[PDB]
Swiss-Prot record, chain A:
This is NADH-quinone oxidoreductase subunit 11. The keyword Lipid biosynthesis does not apply. It is a multi-pass membrane protein. The chain crosses the membrane at residues 1-21, 25-45, 59-79. It comes from Thermus thermophilus (strain ATCC 27634 / DSM 579 / HB8). One of its GO terms (biological process) is ATP synthesis coupled electron transport. Belongs to the complex I subunit 4L family. The lineage of its organism: Bacteria, Thermotogati, Deinococcota, Deinococci, Thermales. It is found in: Cell inner membrane. It is an enzyme of class 7 (translocase).
UniProtKB/Swiss-Prot annotation, chain B:
It comes from Thermus thermophilus (strain ATCC 27634 / DSM 579 / HB8). It catalyses: a quinone + NADH + 5 H(+)(in) = a quinol + NAD(+) + 4 H(+)(out). Pfam families: Oxidored_q4. InterPro entries: NAD(P)H_OxRDtase_bac/plastid, NADH_UbQ/plastoQ_OxRdtase_su3, NDAH_ubi_oxred_su3_sf. This is NADH-quinone oxidoreductase subunit 7. Its EC number is 7.1.1.-. The keyword Protein transport does not apply. GO terms for cellular component: NADH dehydrogenase complex; plasma membrane. Its main location: membrane.
Curated annotation (Swiss-Prot), chain C:
This is NADH-quinone oxidoreductase subunit 10. The keyword Cell membrane applies. It catalyses: a quinone + NADH + 5 H(+)(in) = a quinol + NAD(+) + 4 H(+)(out). It comes from Thermus thermophilus (strain ATCC 27634 / DSM 579 / HB8). Its EC number is 7.1.1.-.
From Swiss-Prot, chain D:
It catalyses: a quinone + NADH + 5 H(+)(in) = a quinol + NAD(+) + 4 H(+)(out). Its EC number is 7.1.1.-. It comes from Thermus thermophilus (strain ATCC 27634 / DSM 579 / HB8). One of its GO terms (cellular component) is plasma membrane. GO terms for molecular function: NADH dehydrogenase (ubiquinone) activity; NADH:ubiquinone reductase (non-electrogenic) activity; quinone binding. It comes from the Bacteria. GO terms for biological process: ATP synthesis coupled electron transport. The lineage of its organism: Bacteria, Thermotogati, Deinococcota, Deinococci, Thermales. It is found in: Cell inner membrane. The chain crosses the membrane at residues 1-21, 30-50, 57-77, 79-99, 104-124, 137-157, 172-192, 204-224, 230-250, 257-277, 280-300, 322-342, 360-380, 400-420. Belongs to the complex I subunit 2 family. This is NADH-quinone oxidoreductase subunit 14. The gene is nqo14. Disulfide bonds: none annotated.
C-alpha cells in the first residue's frame, strides 16, 4: 500500500512541477512523471485485482509516446524560429 | 520463468562493474602532473570558436528519435505475441498482422514523404 | 521488503524532487531516468517483470532520449529568461502540490486491500492472451492512434 | 461495424493522398462520412457489441451528430493539404470510439485518438493559433493525467475497468471525480473552462465549428456513462453557468463570447446527468449542434482568423437567409419557444427537478434569462448597419446546409413528437 | 416627485444590470492568458470539486 501512497506523492510532485515550471519541456516532463505515478498505481491494483492493470499501464506508456511525439512537434513548430519557449511571452489572448 | 536470486546477482554485477569503473576513474584522476593552463582548458581549434556561434542543429535527429520511440513501442507490443504465439491461433496471428500493417502504413507515409528535410 | 523498499522509495521521491526543483533541464531528465530505473526495480519487486523491462527500454531508451535530442538541438537549459517571475506561485504551488496528494491520501487512508495474487511474475507469456483477446480492441485502437500521431507530427512540422 | 468503415477509409486515404489530389481526398472523405452516417441510419435499433465496443442509443445518437458536424465542416474546408482532411476522418473515428465503449482505458485511448488531430487542425499558422494550440495541448495533457489516475483508482475499487461496477465509498467517489475532471474538460465544464475562450478565439472558424459540434457531443456521450453524484454536479453546473454568462457579458469578440456560451450550455446539459436520460440529452445536443454549426459556417463565410461582434451585423442586407438563420439560431440557443432549444432546455430541467435539485435549477434559469443580453445583441444585430468587415458570401453548398439546419431547428421546436419518440431503441 | 421616484427606480434597475456586467468583467479578468494561471485555477477547482464529493 506504501507504493500507492508513493504514486500519489509523485502525482503531487508532477503537479508541483507543472505549476512551477516555466518552460514547456519541463512541464511535459512533469506530466510524464504524473502518468508514470498513475502507472504505478495501476500496477499495484493489478497485483491486487489480477494483472489487467499491467496491460493498462502498458497502453498508458503507448499514450505517453504518442503525446510526447505530438507535443515535441508542436513545440518545435512554435519555438524554432522563436526565442525561449517561455509561455509567459504569449499573452495576446486575455479575458 | 526465473527466480529473484538472479536479479540480486544482476544488482551485484552492476555494483561490481560500477565499483571497478570508479576505481579506474580514481587511478586516472589521482595520477597526473597537475599543471593547468588557460589555453589548455580552452575548447578547441586555434584561438576560439571551433564551432562557436552556430544556429540550432537540424531537426532530422528529432524525426529519427520519434520514429524510433513509436516503432519501439511497436516492438514492445509484438513481443508478448512472439512468446505466446501458437496459443493465439490464426485469430491472434491475424490480429497481430493487422497491427503490423497499420504501423507499417505509418512508416509508408513517412517514407513516401521522406525525411531529407 | 522494507529494507530495500525504503531505499527505493527514497530514491523515487528524491528523483522527483530533483526533476521538479532543479533548473537544469538535463539534470531533470537524468533524474527522471534514475527514477524510471528505480521504478522498474520496484515493478520487478511487484512481480510485474516484463513491464519493467519495457519501462527501461521504451521510456528511458526512447522517450526521454528524444527529449534530450530536442533540448540539445534547442539549448533551452537556462530557462529563466523572459521571467514574469510570479514568485508567490512557487510556495503556493506547494500548497496545491500538497492538496492533490491529501485527498488522494484520504481515498487510500483507512483502506485495507488484498495485495495477494500469485501473478507468477508479469511475464509476457501470460500477458499475450490478454493483449490479443480481451485487450485486442484496445491494442488495435492504440496502433491506429500511433499512426495518427505520426501523421499529426509529420503534417505539423513539414517545413515547405 | 461502422467503425470498420471509418478505419478502412482513414487507413486507405492515408496512402491514397500520395496518389490523389487534395480535392479527390476531400470527396472521398465526404463519401466515407456520408456512408458511415447512412450505416448508422440503417442500424437504428440494431445494437451490436464485440468487446468493450458497445453500441447503444448514446453511441448512435452522438456519433450521428459528430458525423453531421464533420461533414458540414468538410464542406467548407478546401485547403490543398490532404492532411487537413485526414485528421477530420481520424477525429471522427476517435470520437466514435469515445461514445461507443465502457472500458475506462479504451476511453483514454479514444480521448487521445480524438484530441491529437484537434490540436493540429487549429494551425492556420497565426501566432495566436499556435498560442491556443499550446494552451490546449498542455491543459489537455493535464486533464489526461487526472483522468488516468481516476481510472487507476477505479480499478482500485473493483476488479474491472468497465463502468457499471458496484463501486465503493470514498475511493470510488475520488476515482469518479478524477474521471469527471477530464471528461468535463472535454465538455467545456467549469471550473475547467479556461481553455475554451482562448482556443475558440485563436483557431480558424470552421475548426471551431467542428469543435463546438463534435467535441461537445462526444464529451457528453462519454459523460453519461459516469454515475456522477449530484453534489459535484451542482458545483459544476453553478460555477459553469454563473461564470460563463457573467464573463460572456463583458466580451467584445464573437468567438470568445460563443465559447463562453458553450460553457453555459454545457452547464445546462449537465442537468440530464442527474437522471442520465440520454434521450432528452440526445435531443438537446442535436439542436445545439445544428444551431452552432450553422452559426460557425456563417462566421467562416465572414472571417476565419477572428470575427468581431460588429461583423455579424447587417448580414440580412448582405444575405437574407443567413440573417434569418442566425436570428433563429440565437433564439434557439436562448431556449425560446417554439424553438427546439426550448424543448431541450425543458427536458434537461425536468430531469433535474425530477432528481429534486431546486436551487441549482432556478439559478441556471435566472442566469439563462440574464443571457438574453448578448443572445439578443447577436440575434437582432443581423439588421444593423454594416460597418467595415470582410465578407465573403459563401457557396450554395453552405447556404443550403444552413437553410436545412435552421428549418430543422424550428421544426423540432414545433413538433418534437416526431423524432423524440425514437431516441430510445427507435420504434 | 413620484415621477422622479419612478425615474430613480428604473435607474436602480439599470444599476442592477450594471452590477451584473461589472461582476461579469471581474470574472472575465480572471482569464489573463498566462497558461500557469489557467493550470493553477484548473487544479484549484479540481481539488475543490474532489473535496465537495465527500
Amino acid at each position: 500500500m506504501s507504493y500507492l501512497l508513493t504514486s500519489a506523492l509523485l502525482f503531487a510532485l508532477g503537479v508541483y512541477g507543472v505549476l512551477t515550471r516555466r518552460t514547456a519541456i519541463l512541464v511535459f516532463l512533469s506530466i510524464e512523471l504524473m502518468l508514470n505515478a498513475a502507472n504505478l498505481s495501476l500496477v499495484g491494483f493489478a497485483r491486487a485485482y489480477g494483472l489487467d492493470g499491467q496491460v493498462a499501464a502498458l497502453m498508458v506508456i503507448a499514450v505517453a509516446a504518442a503525446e510526447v511525439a505530438v507535443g515535441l512537434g508542436l513545440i518545435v513548430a512554435i519555438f524554432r524560429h522563436r526565442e525561449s519557449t517561455a509561455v509567459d511571452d504569449l499573452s495576446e489572448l486575455r479575458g | 520463468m526465473a527466480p529473484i536470486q538472479e536479479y540480486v546477482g544482476t544488482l551485484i554485477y552492476v555494483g561490481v562493474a560500477l565499483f571497478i569503473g570508479v576505481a579506474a576513474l580514481l587511478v586516472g584522476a589521482l595520477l597526473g602532473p597537475k599543471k593547468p593552463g588557460r589555453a589548455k582548458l580552452m575548447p578547441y581549434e586555434s584561438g576560439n570558436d571551433p564551432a562557436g556561434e552556430v544556429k540550432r542543429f537540424p531537426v532530422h535527429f528529432y524525426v529519427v528519435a520519434m520514429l524510433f520511440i513509436l516503432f519501439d513501442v511497436e516492438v514492445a507490443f509484438l513481443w508478448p505475441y512472439a512468446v505466446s504465439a501458437g496459443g493465439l491461433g490464426l485469430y491472434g496471428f491475424l490480429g497481430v498482422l493487422a497491427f503490423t500493417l497499420l504501423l507499417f502504413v505509418g512508416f509508408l507515409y513517412e517514407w513516401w514523404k521522406g525525411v531529407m528535410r | 521488503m522494507s529494507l530495500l523498499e525504503g531505499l527505493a522509495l527514497f530514491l523515487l521521491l528524491l528523483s522527483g524532487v530533483l526533476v521538479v526543483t532543479l533548473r537544469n533541464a538535463i539534470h531533470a531528465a537524468l533524474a527522471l531516468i534514475l527514477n524510471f530505473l528505480v521504478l522498474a526495480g520496484v515493478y520487478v519487486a511487484l512481480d510485474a517483470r516484463f513491464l519493467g523491462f519495457i519501462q527501461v527500454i521504451v521510456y528511458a531508451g526512447a522517450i526521454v532520449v528524444l527529449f534530450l535530442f530536442v533540448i540539445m538541438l534547442l539549448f533551452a537549459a537556462q530557462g529563466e529568461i523572459g521571467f514574469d517571475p510570479l514568485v508567490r506561485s512557487r510556495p503556493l504551488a506547494a500548497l496545491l502540490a500538497l492538496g492533490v496528494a491529501g485527498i488522494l491520501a484520504a481515498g487510500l487512508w483507512g483502506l485495507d486491500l488484498a495485495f495477494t495474487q500469485d501473478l507468477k511474475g508479469g511475464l509476457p507469456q501470460a500477458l499475450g492472451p490478454l493483449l490479443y483477446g480481451d485487450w485486442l480492441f484496445v491494442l488495435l485502437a492504440v496502433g491506429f492512434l500511433l499512426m495518427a500521431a505520426t501523421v499529426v507530427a509529420v503534417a505539423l512540422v513539414e517545413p515547405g | 461495424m461502422t467503425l470498420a468503415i471509418l478505419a478502412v477509409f482513414s487507413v486507405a486515404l492515408t496512402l491514397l493522398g500520395f496518389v490523389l489530389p487534395p480535392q479527390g481526398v476531400k470527396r472521398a472523405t465526404l463519401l466515407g462520412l456520408a456512408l458511415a452516417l447512412a450505416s448508422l441510419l440503417l442500424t437504428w435499433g440494431k445494437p451490436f457489441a464485440f468487446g468493450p465496443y458497445a453500441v447503444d442509443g448514446v453511441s448512435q445518437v452522438f456519433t450521428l451528430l459528430a458525423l453531421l458536424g464533420a461533414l458540414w465542416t468538410v464542406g467548407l474546408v478546401r485547403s490543398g493539404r490532404f492532411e487537413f482532411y485526414l485528421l477530420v476522418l481520424y477525429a471522427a473515428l476517435g470520437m466514435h470510439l469515445l461514445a461507443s465503449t465502457r472500458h475506462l482505458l479504451l476511453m483514454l485511448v479514444a480521448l487521445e485518438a480524438l484530441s491529437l488531430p484537434l490540436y493540429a487542425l487549429a494551425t492556420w499558422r497565426r501566432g495566436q493559433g499556435l498560442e491556443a494550440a499550446l494552451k490546449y495541448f498542455l491543459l489537455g495533457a493535464l486533464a489526461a493525467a487526472f483522468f488516468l489516475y481516476g481510472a487507476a483508482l477505479f480499478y482500485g475499487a473493483t476488479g474491472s475497468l468497465v463502468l457499471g461496477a458496484p463501486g465503493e465509498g470514498p475511493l470510488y467517489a475520488l476515482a469518479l471525480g478524477l474521471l469527471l475532471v477530464g471528461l468535463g474538460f472535454k465538455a467545456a465544464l467549469a471550473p475547467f473552462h479556461f481553455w475554451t475562450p482562448d482556443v475558440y478565439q485563436g483557431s480558424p472558424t470552421p475548426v471551431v465549428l467542428f469543435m463546438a459540434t463534435s467535441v461537445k457531443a462526444a464529451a457528453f456521450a462519454a459523460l453519461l456513462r459516469v454515475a456522477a453524484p449530484p453534489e459535484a454536479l451542482a458545483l459544476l453546473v453553478a460555477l459553469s453557468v454563473v461564470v460563463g454568462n457573467l464573463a460572456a457579458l463583458a466580451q467584445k469578440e464573437a468567438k470568445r463570447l460563443l465559447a463562453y456560451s458553450s460553457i453555459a450550455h454545457a452547464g445546462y446539459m449537465a442537468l440530464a446527468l442527474y437522471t442520465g436520460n440520454a434521450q432528452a440529452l440526445g435531443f438537446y445536443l442535436l439542436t445545439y449542434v445544428l444551431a452552432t454549426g450553422l452559426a460557425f459556417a456563417v462566421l467562416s463565410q465572414i472571417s476565419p482568423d477572428r470575427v468581431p461582434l460588429e461583423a455579424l451585423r447587417g448580414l440580412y442586407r448582405k444575405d437574407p437567409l443567413l440573417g434569418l438563420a442566425f436570428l433563429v439560431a440565437m433564439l434557439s440557443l436562448l431556449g425560446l419557444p417554439p424553438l427546439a432549444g426550448f424543448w431541450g432546455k425543458y427536458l434537461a430541467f425536468a430531469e433535474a427537478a425530477r432528481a429534486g435539485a431546486w436551487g441549482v435549477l432556478v439559478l441556471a434559469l435566472v442566469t439563462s434569462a440574464v443571457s438574453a443580453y448578448y443572445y439578443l445583441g447577436l440575434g437582432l444585430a443581423v439588421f444593423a448597419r454594416p460597418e467595415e468587415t470582410p465578407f465573403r458570401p459563401g457557396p450554395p453548398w453552405a447556404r443550403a446546409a444552413v437553410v436545412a439546419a435552421g428549418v430543422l431547428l424550428l421544426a423540432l421546436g414545433l413538433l418534437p413528437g416526431l423524432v423524440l419518440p425514437a431516441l430510445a431503441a427507435g420504434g | 416627485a413620484l415621477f422622479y421616484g419612478d425615474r430613480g427606480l428604473l435607474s436602480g434597475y439599470f444599476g442592477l444590470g450594471g452590477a451584473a456586467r461589472s461582476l461579469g468583467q471581474g470574472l472575465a479578468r480572471l482569464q489573463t492568458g498566462y497558461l500557469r494561471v489557467y493550470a493553477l485555477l484548473f487544479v484549484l477547482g479540481a481539488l475543490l470539486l474532489l473535496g465537495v464529493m465527500r
